[PDB]
Design a protein around this ligand. Sequence first.
Ligand code: EYE
Ligand code: ZN
Length: 197
Amino acid sequence: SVPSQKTYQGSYGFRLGFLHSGTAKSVTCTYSPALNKLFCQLAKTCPVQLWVDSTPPPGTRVRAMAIYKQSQHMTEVVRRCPHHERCSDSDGLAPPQHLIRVEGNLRAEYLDDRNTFRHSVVVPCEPPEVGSDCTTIHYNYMCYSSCMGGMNRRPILTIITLEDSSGNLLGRDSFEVRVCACPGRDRRTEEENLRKK
Ligand SMILES: CCn1c2ccc(C[NH2+]C)cc2c2ccc(-c3ccc(C)s3)cc21
Ligand SMILES: [Zn+2]
């Protein structure tokens, strides 16, 4: 009824990482460690790093799914709003209803769960390129947090799960997301509100 959000490193030491993009007015994606919250513009690249302490088996995959953060909304499927699901902006692979897309990965698969109706996007787990210490997935969020008839100002969390080839859990991490026009300003405001509290 509600997917778990419990952080779980598992046998491979799985966890996420984020770049340090700052809070300038022009920034398009920025992550707040103090809030565990990503702030991003609509349909812009969100680099999310994957870190492990040891190599998971061939066939391991990485799934992303959004849920509402507030308990009274957690059973509602997070989906694109009535405008954005109809705006014909598909990449040829993501269903138009899905909030979260993966950029530039032809092996991405989009699931409409037959029992929960929830949406997710899953890719093969890949090792870092030679010379790199981690792997990065580029996500896009395809509605604003404020979109009426969709998220409608309700905060969401993205849950990233490392899965075996059957879909069994190997690791889990998560972060809050706000999709907004000015992520740098909103991160600064929310961090200041946190400090004042
Ligand atoms: C989570 C991304 N990923 C890593 C992230 C950070 C580091 C540490 N760097 C210093 C190693 C790996 C790593 C090693 C192997 C693999 C895979 C092998 C076979 C697969 C199907 S995935 C994935 C990996
Ligand atoms: Zn929308």
